[PDB]
Amino acid sequence: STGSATTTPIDSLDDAYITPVQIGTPAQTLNLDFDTGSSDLWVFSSETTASEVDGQTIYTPSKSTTAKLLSGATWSISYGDGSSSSGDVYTDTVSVGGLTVTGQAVESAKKVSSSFTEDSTIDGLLGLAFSTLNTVSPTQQKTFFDNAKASLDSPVFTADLGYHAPGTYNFGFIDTTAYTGSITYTAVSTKQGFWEWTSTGYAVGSGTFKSTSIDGIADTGTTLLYLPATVVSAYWAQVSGAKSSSSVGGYVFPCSATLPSFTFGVGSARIVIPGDYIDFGPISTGSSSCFGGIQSSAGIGINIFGDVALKAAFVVFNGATTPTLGFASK
């Protein structure tokens, strides 16, 4: 089997991407944030604290004839950005663009943190990292990809995020018309539960490529590209007026600037992120200071190849016996 769904930016900055997901019987369609940096499929629901729901579409397990409460199971997640959510668990039918999983754990939110409530466009998350990170207790649950894997034509999923435009998540197949050239595959470590790989280096604009190992994760659930301080300082040094702002919380630059591109290495291959992809607009409404799309990972503890990097490539999340990541220009 295969599945194919369109993923859409939630706003004009591509802060996140939403993909419609069918849950239950009859189908309840929620727009979820497909996240390769986490492993919980959780949704806003009829059980979420009323004051914490503001515009989101909710999953009502009592209206699904296939929903079964998973006895004694609870979940609780805390994300890298400070957000959190928790609740109980049901098993139900979940479909993504024609691909169906029966008995998928659907984590129903009883509580969500302010940033989830404030984002009316995201009805929940669909985790695509390794099931070892799933927070369901006392019995850990599998991701949608893990549950579907055996049935897929090929044990893979691909991320093709668009820049200011719709894109696609495919399950079970590689669309050879969605990229140019060839896909370069690279080793993945699953030790931390992430799609963790090692970039071979970088270049800023038309500059000399620096060969240096950058260990990081391919994370569709993180907006920006988080890299070592030395790398990020080298990038922003090429932008007149750019500086690290402690008050804003990162590198900012004059909105009138034209940004240089950023290239990252995947083995001997190179992915070029166009400069416009690194512009995240005014730091505050009407400001002429803009927020950078490339930021230091010094405070995080891990480098993150978020949507800024991933949307410049056709990305293969290969769930073969030994998982690997594939990247191609597009």
Ligand SMILES: c1cnc2c(c1)ccc1cccnc12
């Ligand atoms: C991810 C993280 N931080 C940001 C954005 C996206 C977009 C704009 C912005 C403006 C000021 C500070 N942070 C951000």
